[PDB]
Amino acid sequence: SVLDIGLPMSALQRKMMHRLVQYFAFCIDHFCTGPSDSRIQEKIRLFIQSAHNIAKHPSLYDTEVRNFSSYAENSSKFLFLQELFKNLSPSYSKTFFLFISNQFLANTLTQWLKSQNIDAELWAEHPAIWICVSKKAPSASHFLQSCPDLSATIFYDIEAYMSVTSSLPSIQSLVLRLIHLGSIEHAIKCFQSSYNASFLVNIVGVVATLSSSESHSSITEKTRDIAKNVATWLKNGENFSSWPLPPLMDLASLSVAE
Amino acid sequence: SVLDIGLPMSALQRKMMHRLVQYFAFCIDHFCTGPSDSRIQEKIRLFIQSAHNIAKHPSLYDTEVRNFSSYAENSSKFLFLQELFKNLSPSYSKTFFLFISNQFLANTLTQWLKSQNIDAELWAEHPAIWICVSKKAPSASHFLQSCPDLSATIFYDIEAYMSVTSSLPSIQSLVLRLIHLGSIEHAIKCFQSSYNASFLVNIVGVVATLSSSHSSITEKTRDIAKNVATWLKNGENFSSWPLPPLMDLASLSVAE
Amino acid sequence: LEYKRKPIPDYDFMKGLETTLQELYVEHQSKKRRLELF
Amino acid sequence: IELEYKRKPIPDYDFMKGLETTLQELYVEHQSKKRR
């Protein structure tokens, strides 16, 4: 019911992940090899947040005001969403709900999709795609009971998934998850099954290891091929049995605890 | 009763102190600004010991061995000891016991003072100066009860001081301490007073803050050595002790 | 204990993170420009 | 709650050896300027 779309990280995102782990090297080593104090755990939450942010969009660490449409350069997620509707065309007529755990990106995405002639707009307490800030999920749940006849759901990021799943009752609709390969999102996916005492330790450890796919051309190719496949899939009545994507590779062997 | 001899650190030592604090930056900041766990404290012990080692001699971080005479180059403690006995001459006839908390440096010190024709020897069990390892203090105590008539004591490093002071009873002869200005030795000296719970945090914090000249170092050390020697010749009068006390570092405290 | 002062005056963990991540962003921009010219 | 620890998060990370190294690295690179 809940399906993952593995999308590759850009060179920039990987650099940032490498820099992040390096900056937190001591803290990660400490936290992942034994009992740690409350303040260490506080700092690990900042590590996790930063990793989420990089996985959402690297330009969350741009200081300057930038021209919308600058952005799809370094995000497989933006490119995916573009190429999906590009190959979905005006034939398809189901209403998408997209959840994203960042106000700025919600605005930028919404404006950028319009720019490419896609009927997208922000949610608030009928279009081709609603763009919903995960904070404003409490309202959308009401309207995700009525349109289960025709309403598909995309999670831009795992943070939004974490947030929306816990707050709202389990959703009766098609759920797509955009998950960056090798990111914290991937790690959270592989240790979702637990949420035990070793959950934080493992997702940090795996991410740390991974940050201790290829180039721009190849990323674009892969992203389009994934986008074409998913679109084609949605056109043909969203068969569970003919889902065309391989699942995310399991990272359990890279665990550090339990 | 304990008379401190503040000696300046070399450029190398200050660099190593700067590198040390830089390497431990996250750990120091964490430890000194809030509650910390057992394992943080354990890693801080390594910072503290490294700081002692630098204060003892930077050559503890030499990968290869080396021949004496190279050592005084970077330690004002070595220089100080040369100049003391040089200027003390064959006139003075009281026996010194130097305590040091490193075997390699004890050997190196003896073999360098022997190099400058100072009657120095390693303590196994009368000469100008006995170079004794702090580990072997429990033996010297017995003999620091009979010669109080004429036996002075030099502590080369603060570890040597702490180890010997406690393990033995109160030494009722002269006590000199070699303490590097702005080092962890200075810091320990200032925060000795309390014997409490903000101790580690303060010595680490103070040293961190202070770590965030060749010919002049040589001059000052020479002057200090001459003054102490002069002072010893004149019957070690209390009211004429020539050196200023170590400056108070309480204002740089991070806690309590 | 009561913590009246920072041990390393210029050190700030949380702030240095933002700095280094943002500093990397601008490094990429320069690399992007350099590629576009050459 | 207590955990069994399988692996290091950063495989090549060694805090103690990195200290040993960097301090010795500084020492010998100071000897370079002694020559120079």
Residue numbers in the entry:
A (entry chain A): 132 to 198, 216 to 273, 281 to 367, 394 to 439
B (entry chain B): 132 to 198, 216 to 273, 281 to 367, 396 to 439
C (entry chain C): 429 to 466
D (entry chain D): 427 to 462
Text lifted from the article:
The conserved shelterin complex caps chromosome ends to protect telomeres and regulate telomere replication. In fission yeast Schizosaccharomyces pombe, shelterin consists of telomeric single- and double-stranded DNA-binding modules Pot1-Tpz1 and Taz1-Rap1 connected by Poz1, and a specific component Ccq1. Here, we report the crystal structures of Pot1DBD-single-stranded-DNA, Pot1372-555-Tpz1185-212 and Tpz1425-470-Ccq1123-439 complexes and propose an integrated model depicting the assembly mechanism of the shelterin complex at telomeres.
After an extensive screening of deletion mutations, we identified a construct of Ccq1123-439 with a deletion of residues 199–215 (Ccq1123-439 Δ199–215), which could form a stable binary complex with Tpz1425-470 and produce high-quality crystals for structural studies. We determined the Tpz1CBM-Ccq1TAD complex structure by the SAD method at a resolution of 2.4 Å. The Tpz1CBM-Ccq1TAD complex exhibits a butterfly-shaped architecture with two Ccq1TAD molecules as the ‘wings’ and Tpz1CBM as the ‘antenna’. The two Tpz1CBM polypeptides adopt symmetric conformations and each Tpz1CBM contains an N-terminal loop and a C-terminal helix, which respectively interact with the two Ccq1TBM molecules in the heterotetamer complex. In the center of the Tpz1CBM-Ccq1TAD complex, the two Ccq1TAD molecules mediate a dimeric contact in a head-to-head fashion, burying ~500 Å2 surface area between the two monomers. The Tpz1CBM polypeptide makes a sharp turn at Asp438 and Tyr439 so that the C-terminal helix makes direct contacts with the other Ccq1TAD monomer in the complex. The hydrophobic portion of the amphipathic helix of Tpz1CBM fits into a long groove formed by helices α1, α3 and α4 of Ccq1TAD through extensive hydrophobic contacts. Collectively, we conclude that hydrophobic contacts at the interface are the major driving force underlying the Ccq1-Tpz1 interaction.
